[PDB]
């Protein structure tokens, strides 16, 4: 517990914005109509063949009226589709439709590409040293 | 340079710590806002006279759900509208806005308290690091 450097807060901020313009950019020109939120969701439904609505937004630390709303949108752009659970057939599961699938594969890797270009000026060190300030903070909390 | 993978989620894990403990934070002060709303007032409040289209560029979102969003602030005194039209706090937007913006720093001062003082200095460095590349051009 010291006392808080006044850069710290409006540099993070400004490195927060900064990633959210480059991805989104690259995003649109690619025509993707996505969010990073949306990149996520679609990356985690790929990765857990079967999800459930509530294990969703419990990854994802959000209420699940939000998470309904975003998986409302998406099956709305047929990305997402929902089918009843055979086995305690009480719950949904989700699964990406072909064109999620495909349109997740293809953020993604845009995605890889932005985050190269974004941590590129920084050296292996510079990385692991932001990675491990950042860690600190968080794990004290 | 190889690309280290757990920064983005690092960076990610961050920022997801800071929004809850905001969003929590406007709950117990009751001003009832979501972390989102406190970010457009911020903006909005920075950068006098901005336009529905500056602040959706900004934002990262379409102009549709940030057309609604403002509707939902000016609903609630919070925000009036004025080729294009620009936005400015009311009174109370600017009261409300100061609230956040005091419950902004605390969750960050909470955040980075635990580190040293040198530690700090050196997360900054890194920070402005991210930023794109060397600009500046005098001549």
């Not at 808080?4 to 995003?27: W, Y």
């Amino acid at each position: 517990n010291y006392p808080v450097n006044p850069d710290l807060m409006p540099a993070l901020m400004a490195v927060f914005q900064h990633v959210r313009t480059r991805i989104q950019s690259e995003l649109d020109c690619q025509r993707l109509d996505l969010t990073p939120p949306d990149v996520h969701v679609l990356k985690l439904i790929d990765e857990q063949r079967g999800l459930n609505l509530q294990d969703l937004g419990r990854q994802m630390c959000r209420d699940k009226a939000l998470i309904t709303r975003k998986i409302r949108e998406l099956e709305g752009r047929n990305l997402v589709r929902r089918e009843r659970n055979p086995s305690d057939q009480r719950s949904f599961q989700l699964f990406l439709t072909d064109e999620g699938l495909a349109i997740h594969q293809h953020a993604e890797a845009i995605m890889s590409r932005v985050h190269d270009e974004l941590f590129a000026p920084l050296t292996p060190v510079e990385q692991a040293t932001l990675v491990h300030l950042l860690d600190q903070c968080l794990a004290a909390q």
